Design a protein around this ligand. Structure first.
Ligand SMILES: *[C@@H]1O[C@H](CO)[C@@H](O[C@@H]2O[C@H](CO)[C@@H](O[C@@H]3O[C@H](CO)[C@@H](O)[C@H](O[C@H]4O[C@H](CO)[C@@H](O)[C@H](O)[C@@H]4O)[C@@H]3O)[C@H](O)[C@H]2NC(C)=O)[C@H](O)[C@H]1NC(C)=O
Ligand SMILES: *[C@@H]1O[C@H](CO)[C@@H](O[C@@H]2O[C@H](CO)[C@@H](O[C@@H]3O[C@H](CO[C@H]4O[C@H](CO)[C@@H](O)[C@H](O)[C@@H]4O)[C@@H](O)[C@H](O)[C@@H]3O)[C@H](O)[C@H]2NC(C)=O)[C@H](O)[C@H]1NC(C)=O
Ligand SMILES: *[C@@H]1O[C@H](CO)[C@@H](O[C@@H]2O[C@H](CO[C@@H]3O[C@H](CO)[C@@H](O)[C@H](O[C@H]4O[C@H](CO)[C@@H](O)[C@H](O)[C@@H]4O)[C@@H]3O)[C@@H](O)[C@H](O)[C@H]2NC(C)=O)[C@H](O)[C@H]1NC(C)=O
Ligand SMILES: *[C@@H]1O[C@H](CO)[C@@H](O[C@@H]2O[C@H](CO)[C@@H](O[C@@H]3O[C@H](CO)[C@@H](O)[C@H](O)[C@@H]3O)[C@H](O)[C@H]2NC(C)=O)[C@H](O)[C@H]1NC(C)=O
Ligand SMILES: *[C@@H]1O[C@H](CO)[C@@H](O[C@@H]2O[C@H](CO)[C@@H](O[C@@H]3O[C@H](CO)[C@@H](O)[C@H](O)[C@@H]3O)[C@H](O)[C@H]2NC(C)=O)[C@H](O)[C@H]1NC(C)=O
Ligand SMILES: *[C@@H]1O[C@H](CO[C@@H]2O[C@H](CO)[C@@H](O[C@@H]3O[C@H](CO)[C@@H](O)[C@H](O)[C@@H]3O)[C@H](O)[C@H]2NC(C)=O)[C@@H](O)[C@H](O)[C@H]1NC(C)=O
Ligand SMILES: *[C@@H]1O[C@H](CO[C@@H]2O[C@H](CO)[C@@H](O[C@@H]3O[C@H](CO)[C@@H](O)[C@H](O)[C@@H]3O)[C@H](O)[C@H]2NC(C)=O)[C@@H](O)[C@H](O)[C@H]1NC(C)=O
Ligand SMILES: *[C@@H]1O[C@H](CO[C@@H]2O[C@H](CO)[C@@H](O[C@@H]3O[C@H](CO)[C@@H](O)[C@H](O)[C@@H]3O)[C@H](O)[C@H]2NC(C)=O)[C@@H](O)[C@H](O)[C@H]1NC(C)=O
Ligand SMILES: *[C@@H]1O[C@H](CO[C@@H]2O[C@H](CO[C@@H]3O[C@H](CO)[C@@H](O)[C@H](O)[C@@H]3O)[C@@H](O)[C@H](O)[C@H]2NC(C)=O)[C@@H](O)[C@H](O)[C@H]1NC(C)=O
Ligand SMILES: *[C@@H]1O[C@H](CO)[C@@H](O[C@@H]2O[C@H](CO)[C@@H](O)[C@H](O)[C@H]2NC(C)=O)[C@H](O)[C@H]1NC(C)=O
Ligand SMILES: *[C@@H]1O[C@H](CO)[C@@H](O)[C@H](O)[C@H]1NC(C)=O
Ligand SMILES: *[C@@H]1O[C@H](CO)[C@@H](O)[C@H](O)[C@H]1NC(C)=O
Ligand SMILES: *[C@@H]1O[C@H](CO)[C@@H](O)[C@H](O)[C@H]1NC(C)=O
Lengths: 232, 235, 603
């Protein structure tokens, strides 16, 4: 049984997200969702990840291996968008408040709030525990940073007829169930060094046709600021 | 990779790390003041944009890079050996250009290419380097990893490893009982032999079947037949 | 009497018990103070032990916003063997609150029930003790939280029809979640999260306003076990018919089984489904025959995401099963794995055929493509392959160009990524084009004209002498080995000094090419500095001792002189007769000598 990485090959993706401080994970006994730390005590994540108790892991180099550089924070309050729809997962964005201020270090930091909407063809990075394996869909112990351009709004609407609104943009392209952005339910999507969106949903684990759906954060900048001010 | 040992501080001045997008992926050997020799497989397909490749000469640990012992350089031209096929993973040799010129110091030292009519005897226990991992499914070690493995003849390697063509274009080095291996992972280090205090470039490491697996030595790329090709660009 | 930190005394101040054990449900104090109503300040309504068979209870601050986070707990106690029914009318709250309903007290308060953001309606608990906990985790004054009423009814007077019939529109009816499961069947009103798996509507109502039960909607990354255990059914003289509706839509749907547990510990499972059946409720009908009391267990091994399983409209009817009005479920079709292999690639290309795409440029190229183009032309010609459009992927697939004319193909260029790419020329009339792509991310492809010519990639030479460099720049004498760079390739400094009649790189006689003729170097003015300069110009090492041996060139030999600019002065003058010529004796280059801390193993 030869190993997949016979040569000096990392699979074409940034394994473990080295020097990536904006990626954080949500744990409640298991890994279910990811998120992006925007402020000292604010995390943007997928709005369908809400539960009774949430723990935030910052700078987690490996999900199954504790390198000692990660930080565990007990979440205080989770706020979903007032116009969030459960049926179509519209406005699938939520904000988590940290009970303690984040400690700035090499692998833990805050990413600046976006100021410009995403554009077609922009060099963008999707961070998360994507399904990186020779065959099958499973969450590995490593992390995936996929470099994928942002698709056009018309193409995004055509990918999901009747399931794409003005707050949804597509980064995944074409089709395929192998190593890709996949799900992770809230994987950060950062274009040009600024956070641009999260992974909301999609046609399964990129089984065929449309890869997935990404919810923007630029349209919620005013909402994010209001939530921060009200829940400072 | 199981079996590796941490290299001493500055013990491998001829090994230079390569970063693509800010992550260490491969290693190279300093052949001259403006050229580096690295594995072609680990840099295949990324030669169209040399600006994304950063060469850190004298690299010891990934904790810091802004040190006098480490020389940062930007790759301008990448040359891939024509005989590389990517089917049998043979002749995986590539060269990179270090801007204009590079000096030499204690932590930045050149490498020696094999001489004419030089044959490495089988069973010769030679050193290998590279920034390998503690285990295959683990995190890459922050300290340069070094190991010593014995060479294997091609005729015996064919019988012991009936999986790849290998042939005389590349040489198998490792233990028939396994245990020590460093080919896997993000090592990218070269296989180096001893020639009475003269560090001759025995070869460049390449794909391995399995780390520390008995009767599965690392099949590293032989560079004795490619010395003329390297010297053509060097001279 | 004093207690250690982390524990508190009782009312009589005789026994110390843990703070978490207060009002938990089990009597710990000798006098029962830990369960006393006054000791357990519920605040919600001032009542903690609901010994009555019926009543009502409200959350914190019924007429006022809940500005203060107050945790409330109630214990409802009835006669042994009787069930307790809780009726909920309004639970539309903006989360931040937890409503936990537990059957019994103590170790049984693990996963009995957990309802939030949805009105549970009617919940029936088959025990003499029911624990109702309203937990507020933050100072949120959005809503009071709930206001419910409870009653009691006998748990065994129900027949087999009532105990099984349930549309799930008003809770779980009489079903009890198994305590041995790793999770519980969550109750959902309408479509669930993570679309493209699981039902999008309730079977009973037909729209999203209805309520049903299913696997947890959270993106669980671990395999768990869930199960519904039915109440014991008294034996009947006639076998019954069990009818149900099951929704199994998901890629990772592992299993869904129905078992019978009796006093004989004999299981004869009659219903079992696996895989994806589609986004539609399927009707399952089976016949149940038994002579003693038995329980029907619906078991499901929940896998990772895309494994949602839902159950609705479960009922049991006395009598033999009638003709089923619905067909057996059909598995969701999957892509055929019958040797996908590759696309084979097109045929050989010749001169008349010039324009070509990968497979079909406008739409896409099939996955796992290994297209091979054999570009051939007339003998003596070369191939230029300029791409009009090149919009491939990143580090997934790469177009490779191999030199032909032999089996051992020589790599020419590897192209990948979006954007135009430069033209590629071949050294012969045979070229191989390989499209190496993975099974994912298949873009439009590429397209090239595939033109032929003669020395297309060779730079244009100049006639009438006009010595040219590698790039073709005319440098007859301006840059003829004099330290001046004019050629773009930098070949103006080619090796005009070499060694001849030598058995190695450090043996023989040194010859210099002044303009076009090689002349030997004499020993008239040979010095150590000149020896070092010769070593440097020949790419050699330290200038060790060297002495002349015998002359070979009796004509105008080159005399060597020192210059301040570092370039040896070459004089093509024969100033001596039969002068001995210097034999090249230089050491090896100062390579990577082991000056580091690397050790050598003496074995
Ligand atoms: C979703 O599907 C359901 C399936 O039928 C569909 O039916 C609705 O059901 C609800 C309750 O299940 C109905 O709401 C109530 O139903 C009771 C049943 O007895 C009625 O008695 C109620 O009417 C009382 O109140 C009226 C107020 O003016 C009085 O005028 C009347 O005389 C009664 O006293 C009440 O309707 C609901 O009515 C039905 N709807 C229909 C169209 O039958 C439901 O409509 C579907 N939802 C959708 C499509 O959004
Ligand atoms: C250039 O690209 C072309 C596009 O596919 C290649 O296909 C050629 O297309 C022409 C035009 O249709 C075909 O010519 C036809 O020939 C048949 C008769 O030949 C058939 O029967 C003989 C046996 O008698 C058999 O050997 C052939 O393979 C054919 O099966 C006529 O009836 C038609 O009217 C038409 O004229 C070529 O046959 C076809 N070549 C193929 C399919 O190999 C073309 O080959 C390319 N040119 C090259 C590679 O040099
Ligand atoms: C519903 O009822 C069905 C009954 O049809 C339940 O099926 C269960 O089926 C297993 C059969 O699998 C194997 O049966 C072997 C006995 O024939 C048994 O020995 C196996 O266990 C181990 O055996 C060897 C030796 O130890 C070991 O090397 C194997 O690796 C294996 O681990 C194996 O179980 C049967 O054994 C069960 O008894 C039976 N369960 C019953 C009857 O309750 C099904 O699970 C039921 N579904 C439920 C309860 O949810
Ligand atoms: C690399 O090593 C060299 C010496 O080996 C370091 O010094 C550099 O040496 C060159 C050669 O003499 C100098 O060039 C000279 O510059 C003077 C002007 O200062 C000029 O008059 C001469 O004609 C000649 O061109 C060079 O100036 C000098 N310094 C540099 C290059 O900074 C060099 O510093 C070493 N580089 C590193 C990065 O360590
Ligand atoms: C609540 O319901 C239970 C139903 O189980 C009542 O208990 C009695 O249960 C038995 C079944 O075990 C019922 O059947 C009777 O069984 C006896 C044998 O034990 C048999 O001799 C009788 O002919 C009859 O078949 C019995 O009817 C039932 N008693 C009732 C309904 O009064 C329990 O009494 C109920 N609670 C209250 C407060 O009534
Ligand atoms: C659930 O079904 C049970 C089915 O068991 C069958 O029971 C019948 C009699 O009730 C058996 O028939 C007998 O067969 C004997 C020969 O083996 C004859 O000698 C005898 O006269 C009689 O005809 C039948 O064999 C048996 N099946 C098997 C496979 O053995 C039934 O027994 C239960 O009553 C029923 N439970 C209910 C209706 O609540
Ligand atoms: C020209 O080169 C001279 C080099 O000559 C040889 O150099 C080697 C060093 O690589 C000597 O090897 C050493 O020998 C020692 C014993 O003499 C050993 O103890 C030591 O470990 C090492 O093996 C070798 O002996 C030597 N040969 C002779 C005959 O001495 C160098 O010595 C000159 O300085 C140099 N320049 C000139 C102008 O001659
Ligand atoms: C090739 O790699 C080598 C691995 O080291 C070998 O490990 C064995 C383990 O047994 C050592 O064995 C001991 O050897 C002693 C004699 O050296 C015996 O007395 C003792 O019982 C036991 O057998 C072995 O020594 C050790 N090295 C060797 C080859 O002795 C490495 O050490 C080798 O040096 C390297 N190969 C070569 C060419 O030496
Ligand atoms: C097929 O190859 C074409 C190559 O482009 C061709 O360019 C020709 C140049 O135009 C001349 O330019 C002279 C100098 O500017 C000028 O004096 C003269 O008058 C002409 O304008 C042009 O004549 C050809 O029409 C043009 N070819 C085509 C097909 O338009 C390349 O552009 C194309 O992409 C190739 N096809 C594929 C599928 O790759
Ligand atoms: C790869 O190895 C096979 C054998 O495992 C080689 O096949 C032999 O090739 C030689 C000459 O090429 C023949 O004389 C033998 O008859 C072949 N079969 C054997 C030895 O069983 C094959 O040539 C190798 N590949 C390359 C490119 O050399
Ligand atoms: C850089 O890291 C090395 C690793 O050991 C350490 O020795 C050194 O002190 C650090 N700092 C500098 C300036 O080299
Ligand atoms: C089933 O068949 C029986 C006997 O013919 C009949 O009485 C009954 O109405 C039918 N339907 C149901 C639902 O039992
Ligand atoms: C050196 O070799 C040349 C061959 O081109 C020969 O003509 C010449 O005589 C040789 N000189 C010697 C052997 O001294």
């Amino acid at each position: 049984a030869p190993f997949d990485d016979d040569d000096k090959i990392v699979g074409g993706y940034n394994c473990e997200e080295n020097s990536v401080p904006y990626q954080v994970s949500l744990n409640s006994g298991y890994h279910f969702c990811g998120g992006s730390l925007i402020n000292e005590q604010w995390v943007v994540s997928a709005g369908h990840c809400y539960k009774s108790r949430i723990q935030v892991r910052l700078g987690e180099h490996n999900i199954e291996v504790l390198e000692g550089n990660e930080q565990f924070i007990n979440a205080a309050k989770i706020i979903r968008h007032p116009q969030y729809d459960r049926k179509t997962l519209n406005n699938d964005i939520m904000l988590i408040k940290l009970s303690s201020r984040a400690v700035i270090n090499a692998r833990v930091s805050t990413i600046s709030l976006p100021t410009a909407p995403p554009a077609t063809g922009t060099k963008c990075l999707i961070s998360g525990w994507g399904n990186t394996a020779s065959s099958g869909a499973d969450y590995p112990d490593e992390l995936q940073c996929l470099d994928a351009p942002v698709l056009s709004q018309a193409k995004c609407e055509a990918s999901y007829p009747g399931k794409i609104t003005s707050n949804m943009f597509c980064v995944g392209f074409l089709e395929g169930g192998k190593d890709s952005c996949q799900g992770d339910s809230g994987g950060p999507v950062v274009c040009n060094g600024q956070l641009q969106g999260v992974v909301s949903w999609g046609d399964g684990c990129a089984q065929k046709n449309k890869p997935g759906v990404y919810t923007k954060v630029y349209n919620y900048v005013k909402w994010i600021k209001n939530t921060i001010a009200a829940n400072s | 990779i199981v079996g590796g040992s941490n290299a001493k501080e500055g013990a491998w001045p001829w090994v230079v790390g390569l970063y693509y997008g800010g992550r260490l992926l491969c290693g190279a050997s300093l052949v001259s003041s403006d050229w580096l020799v690295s594995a072609a497989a680990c840099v295949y397909g990324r030669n169209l944009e040399p600006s994304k490749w950063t060469a850190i000469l004298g690299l010891h640990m990934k904790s810091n890079l802004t040190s006098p012992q480490t020389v940062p350089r930007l790759i301008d031209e990448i040359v891939i050996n024509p005989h590389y096929n990517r089917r049998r993973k043979d002749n995986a040799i590539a060269m990179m250009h270090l801007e204009f010129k590079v000096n030499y110091t204690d932590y930045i030292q050149p490498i020696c290419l094999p001489e004419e009519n030089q044959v490495f005897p089988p069973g010769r226990n030679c050193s290998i380097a590279g920034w390998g991992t503690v285990v295959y499914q683990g995190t890459t070690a922050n300290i340069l990893q070094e190991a010593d493995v014995p060479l294997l003849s091609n005729e015996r390697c064919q019988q012991q490893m009936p999986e790849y063509n290998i042939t005389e274009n590349m040489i198998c080095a490792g233990y028939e009982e396994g245990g020590i291996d460093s080919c896997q992972g993000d090592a990218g280090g070269p296989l180096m032999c001893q020639e009475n205090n003269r560090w001759f470039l025995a070869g460049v490491t390449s794909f391995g079947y399995k780390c520390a697996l008995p009767n599965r030595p690392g099949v590293y790329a032989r560079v004795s037949r490619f010395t003329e090709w390297i010297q053509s660009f060097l001279h | 009497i004093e207690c250690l930190p982390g524990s508190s005394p009782c009312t009589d101040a005789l026994t110390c018990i843990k703070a978490d054990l207060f009002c938990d449900g089990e009597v710990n104090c000798p006098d029962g103070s830990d369960e006393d109503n006054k000791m357990c300040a519920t605040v919600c309504d001032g009542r903690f032990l609901l010994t009555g068979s019926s009543g009502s209870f409200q959350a914190t601050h019924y007429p006022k916003p809940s500005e203060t986070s107050v945790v409330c707990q109630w214990i409802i106690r009835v006669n042994q063997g009787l069930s307790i029914k809780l009726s909920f009318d309004d639970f539309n709250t903006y989360y931040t609150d937890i409503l936990d309903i537990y059957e019994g007290v103590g170790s049984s308060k693990i996963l009995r029930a957990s309802i939030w953001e949805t009105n549970p309606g009617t919940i029936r608990i088959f025990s003499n003790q029911v624990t109702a906990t309203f937990l507020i985790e933050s100072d949120e004054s959005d809503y009071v939280g709930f206001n419910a009423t409870y009653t009691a009814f006998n748990s065994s007077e129900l027949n087999n029809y009532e105990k099984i019939n349930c549309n799930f529109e008003d809770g779980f009816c009489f079903w009890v979640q198994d305590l041995n499961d790793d999770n519980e069947w969550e109750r959902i009103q309408g479509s669930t999260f993570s679309p493209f798996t699981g039902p999008n509507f309730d079977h009973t109502f037909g729209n999203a306003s209805g309520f049903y039960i299913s696997t947890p909607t959270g993106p669980g990354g671990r395999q768990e076990r869930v199960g519904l255990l039915s109440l014991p059914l008294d034996p009947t003289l006639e076998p019954a018919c069990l009818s149900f509706w099951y929704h199994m839509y998901g890629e990772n749907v592992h299993k869904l089984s129905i078992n019978i547990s009796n006093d004989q510990n004999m299981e004869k499972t009659v219903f079992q489904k696996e895989g994806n059946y589609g986004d539609n409720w399927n009707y399952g009908q089976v016949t149940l025959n038994e002579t003693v009391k038995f329980k029907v267990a619906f078991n499901a091994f929940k896998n990772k995401i895309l494994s949602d399983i839902a159950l609705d409209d479960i009922s049991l009817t006395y009598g033999i099963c009638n003709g089923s009005l619905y067909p057996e479920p059909t598995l969701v079709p999957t892509p055929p794995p019958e040797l996908p292999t590759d696309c084979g690639g097109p045929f050989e290309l010749w001169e008349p055929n010039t324009t070509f795409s990968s497979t079909n440029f406008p739409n896409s190229y099939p996955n796992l493509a290994f297209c091979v183009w054999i570009l051939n032309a007339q003998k003596g010609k070369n191939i230029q392959l300029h791409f009009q459009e090149f919009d491939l992927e990143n580090i997934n697939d790469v177009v490779e160009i191999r030199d032909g004319e032999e089996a051992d193909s020589l790599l020419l260029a590897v192209y990948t990524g979006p954007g135009p790419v430069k033209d590629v020329f071949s050294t012969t009339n045979r070229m191989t084009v390989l499209l190496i792509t993975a099974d994912v991310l298949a873009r439009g492809g590429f397209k090239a004209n595939f033109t032929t010519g003669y020395h297309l990639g060779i730079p244009e030479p100049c006639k009438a002498d006009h010595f040219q460099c590698k790039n073709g720049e005319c440098v007859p004498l301006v840059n003829l080995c004099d330290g001046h760079l004019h050629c773009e390739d930098g070949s103006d400094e080619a090796d005009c000094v070499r060694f001849f009649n030598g058995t190695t790189n450090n043996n023989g006689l040194v010859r210099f090419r002044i303009q076009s003729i090689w002349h030997t170097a004499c020993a008239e003015n040979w010095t150590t500095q000149i020896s070092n300069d010769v070593c440097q110009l020949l790419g050699l090492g330290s200038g060790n001792s060297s002495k002349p041996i015998f002359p070979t060139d009796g004509g105008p030999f080159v005399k060597l002189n020192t210059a301040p600019d570092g370039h040896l002065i070459l004089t093509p003058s024969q100033q001596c007769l039969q002068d001995s010529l210097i034999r090249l004796q230089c050491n090896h280059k100062s390579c990577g000598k082991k000056l580091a801390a690397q050790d050598i193993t003496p074995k």
